[PDB]
Amino acid sequence: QLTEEQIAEFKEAFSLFDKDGDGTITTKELGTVMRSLGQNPTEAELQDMINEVDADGNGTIDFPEFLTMMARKMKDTDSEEEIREAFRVFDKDGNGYISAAELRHVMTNLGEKLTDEEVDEMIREADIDGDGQVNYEEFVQMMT
Template sequence: EAFSLFDKDGDGQITTKELGTVMRSLGQNPSESELQDMINEVDADNNGTIDFPEFLTMMARKMKDTDSEEEIREAFKVFDRDNNGFISAAELRHVMTSIGERLTDDEVDEMMREA
């Protein structure tokens, strides 16, 4: 599911453009060279994009980051628009819509149940 949020055109590859879109929606503002560096770190086949296995590698590395807890807090703040310490269904829908994910009420409800 996370991979498909990045892979906007559904071609199985994440480009620098797609990576940038998601990063900006999460409050980050990486330069083109920073995006390319992020891709290059995990681009095992050197094709300039990230496929699913490479994405898993990238996520595993991110999870090991020493500051990953702070990054998670910052990402949470993006979703928690009213700063009440909780992410409501409306807040979830707003962020997902801002990154181009149109969700049905059932999909939002399912995501809330899984959380």
């Protein structure tokens, strides 16, 4: 069962995915967000993703499809692979730790207009040990 704050985070995320508010993810915006992080899927690959996620050939994605596709229970192994890939995305530098600066570049790439004080408060509140870096256990427990 979902809760209201989860739905609020979900709609904020869906708005973040769609740069231009239209009600649809759109192929061009999906390609743009794919290239922003540093991947180059081809057009055939992209339409394959589109027809796989959608239940028909309309070529469009709406809000309930995202609810369905991210409310799934992924177990452990596949979830472990997903969290490792997310870590590697956040770990562009070969250090294995997350710093405030790395978060800053990642938000800038994703298109977030934040400030240094905000990211400093973010990393301070998120961190527990107070060393300025986030460990794997903290990341996985936060993933709730």
